[PDB]
Structures are given as structure tokens and as C-alpha cells.
Amino acid sequence: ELEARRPFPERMGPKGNLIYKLITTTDHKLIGIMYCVVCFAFFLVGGLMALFMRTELAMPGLQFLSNEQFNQLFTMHGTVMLLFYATPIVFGFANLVLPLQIGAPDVAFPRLNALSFWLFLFGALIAIAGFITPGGAADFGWTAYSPLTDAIHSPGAGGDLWIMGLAVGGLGTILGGVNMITTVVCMRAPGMTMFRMPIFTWNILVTSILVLIAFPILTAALFGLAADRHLGAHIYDPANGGVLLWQHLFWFFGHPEVYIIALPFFGIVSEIFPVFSRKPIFGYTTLIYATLAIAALSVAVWAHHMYATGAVLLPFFSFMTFLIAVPTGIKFFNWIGTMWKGQLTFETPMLFSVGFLITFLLGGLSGVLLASPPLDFHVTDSYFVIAHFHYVLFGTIVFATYAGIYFWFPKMTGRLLDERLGKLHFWLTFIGFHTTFLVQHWLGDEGMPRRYADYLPTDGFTTLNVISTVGAFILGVSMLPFVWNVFKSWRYGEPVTVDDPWGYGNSLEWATSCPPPRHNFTELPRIRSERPAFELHYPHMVERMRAEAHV
């Protein structure tokens, strides 16, 4: 029984194996791969923006940055790192495994799926292109409040390019969300019922609905904003009532948008915990209800970002915001229950997911504090917020993103990332993030507002800013091990000759080869539960799972 095999898998394709594929591909796997590379390019670009800001806020006074440059820095940093990195990578992972999870050969609209990538890429470049302008890029913040974003207060072309760049990228997001809903409804494999899909597929379908509610209203608001700057309209005139009008629409977009970049990464860890715990996902039916409740509740809580304005019904939004804490808390108890009485080995995909649980909770606790208007009356527009949202956005779009990458890299490569290099990256990232964002809780409470280019030496913010500056550079140097691991393990990584390199995979992508073929499936097993791959690979456990399912 001798089979002929190469000593090593081919490192790279021959000349001309990719360039024509990149611009003509309709395969979701290649499109999903192009997302991650571009998303990480914007991650590195946006991360450098924060480093300039962080190194300027190290010592009191403007050493190398002006007020205008600093104002442009956080606006572009936030815009790039929420809309150009976080939102696309939601569909970056969705183009990767969602057709595999539901047993589909492709997405519903292969052409429209490819259009979303290029539309997003050219939309993101337009907004960033404001830096090359002499006036500079947008300097009014990613919330672009009115009438600051007005032609009178923002006359440069950088703000105009920021508005139109978001509109082009927003159109791609809407098309991507349309594709995902159609793919889930119509492209499901036989035997794959609605309540049999993986949690990640459930989260993406739910997230895509939130896209259709939020992004079109943002496109409408931006178009009205462009009319004011170019046609001299009175859409957002303060005397007309547009100061509240713009904020209401923008936050009706914004809070659904943060859950657009939260629920899919809740799904990502929900696929990793069962695999490395050798246990089924706890509360699988409950997790779906929690996700639906989170999606529904996220639409009518938009005004808790507007507590300091004194123009919203505080009791309504405070109570509704508190309601979101219940389904989110249920997710932790299900994730903890998944690891309970299991067999944890703590690999790199598992290690990052564990860091998510520790990191996310502290940011979640800060969210409940801000949800109450009396407590928000003092910490709003201060570094307590910045500490809260860099604990909740770094717990998911980074920890869960890295966990999913380490989880699905062998699936889409046939090669395994280095575990020793992965452990170094995780610990460096954890230590750096905690060092740079734990002290900012005290800074905001001490009386330091957000969006401040300079502070006086007598303010007493110097010591904590230096500590935060040290940790941020640790985050910067933590990128080198991960980039090196991806660069080396892609071509010289450990080959994967098995369908499931992690052994106890549950979703359908682990029932196919690594990498999957062009149509993702040369065979399909019988689907009788939410873990078809586990049932196929371990037939002797079919009886045990049914009998021991209920405690």
C-alpha cells in the first residue's frame, strides 16, 4: 500500500497563477482570502495612525504633530479601523466558510460577491486619499457630528472624499449582506435545516439583516450631508433642527453597526470552543434566541450615545440598553458551559478565544456603567469611553479574528501556522493591549476628554499617558510575529493531509479536504444534527451524544 506523494507541497504556483484570478474570480474562497489580506493592510495602516497619536500623547505639548494633524489622525484611524477593517472582515470570514458550513458549492450571486470586494476596496481608498490633499483628510471624527462636518466648518476636500468613500464602501456592504441572506435561504444542502446550521452561519445571516437596516440610512444621511456642502442645502441647519437630525440617523446606523462587527465574531468563538473542548456547544438553541434578541434590541437603543445632548428620552433608552446585557450574558454562560467538564488543550485558536472571554467582559461591564445616564453624565466624551470601546472592539474584531484565522488557516491553505510563534503573538498582544488600555479608565475618570491633541503638565495626565504609550508600542511590535508566521507558514508551513487538522470539528467544512476543491465538496455526509463532521468522523459517538444531550 504505497502511494506516491511529493516530499513537500508546492510552495507557490507558477508565474501568472494569481494575477488574472484576482480580478476575475467568482470563487468565495479566493474572494474571502483577498478580504483578509486587504483587511490586514488597512489594520496595519490604521494601527500606524494610532501610534502617531499615542506617541504624541506621551509627553505634554505638541512635539511633532499639530492640532489639525492629530484631529485628522483619529478621524481616519476610526474610519479605517471600524469601516475599512472590521466591517469587511465580517464578510471576509463569511465568504470563507459559510458556503462550506451549509454544504453549498458557491454563494448565491458569485458576480455580485466579487463586486462587493472591489467596490469596498476602491471606496476605502477614496477616503484614505484625503491625506495627499494639502488641506488633509477628515479631521471631524468618525461620528462626523453636525454642523462641524458643514462646508463652513469643514471646507476642505478631505471631508468630501471621506463622505463619498463611505458611500461606495457602504454599497458593497449592502450587496454583501444581500448575498448572505440569499445564500443561507436557498443554497442549503439537503438535510441541513434552519436549526441545524452552525452558530457562525446563524450569526452572519442575522448580521446581514442588521446591515440592510443600518447601512442604507447611513447612505441617505451622507447624501444629504453632501447636498449641504455642495448644493448649499439646509438639511442639517441648526436652526432647522438638523443638529439632532444628523445625530439620530448616524446613531441609528452606528449601534447596529457595532453589532454587525460583534455577532459574527461571537459565532467564530462559538465554533472554536466545542472543537477544543471535545464537547457539544452548550445551549445551541438558546444561543440562536440570544443572537436574535441582540439583533432586535440593537435597533432601538441608538440614543444612549446621546445622553449628554439632553434631547432624548432617557428612561426609554436606558431601560432598553440594559435589556441587551441579558442575552449577551447568556452567551458567556453558554461558552463557559461549553468548556465546563471538558478536555481543554489550549491551542492557538483556543488560546485566543479564551483571551476574548477575559477581555470582552471588562468592556461589557463598562458598557452597563455607561448605559445609566447618571454615570454617563460624567464619563461621556472622555477616555473612559475610549477604554470601554477598545475592550469590546478588541475582544472581538481582533481576538476572535485571530482565533478564526488560526482556526481556518489550515482549511484554506493546507498548511498549519506555527504554534510556538502563535503563542508568542497572543501573549504579546494580550500584555500590550492590557497595559495600554487599563490605565485609560483612570484617565477619563480623572477629567481627560477624548479627541485631545495636547494637555498641560499641571493636568496630571502625564504618568498614565506614558504607561499607555508603552503598552501601545507592545501592540505594534506584536504584529511582527503574526506577519512573519503568516508569511512563512503559507509556503513553508506544516502540510495538512487530513480533512480536520483539529480532530473534533463540528461544522461541515471539516468534512472536506484542505484546501477544499473549487466546488467545496466531493461528497456529503448525512446531516442529522449541528455537528455532521463530528458524527461522520466518530460514528461510535452518535449514540452517546443523543443520550447525554440533556443533563
Partner: protein
Amino acid sequence: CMNDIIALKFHISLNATTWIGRIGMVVLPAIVYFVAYRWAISLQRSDREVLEHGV
């Protein structure tokens, strides 16, 4: 040659346009040569796929 009008219409510094063309006078031809060489060879592979697998 049209940098000054491009600078005025597209809101770009005139010094930037001169130096973009100056650096791009050697960098861009090198980039285009690499892309075109791979693109031309990539097209040949696309034709080989139809020959051995059909339309």
C-alpha cells in the same frame, strides 16, 4: 504636463504632483512591467485551462 490643472481640480499640492511624477517616472514603469509580464503569462494559463478541461 497637466500637473498644475490636476493640482487645482483634484486638490493636490503642486510640489507633490511634481515629485509624484518624478518618483513615478522610474517606479511606475517597473511596477507596470512586472504586472504586465505576470498578466500576459496568466492569460496563457487561462487558455490552457479551457484546452484541457473545456468551456
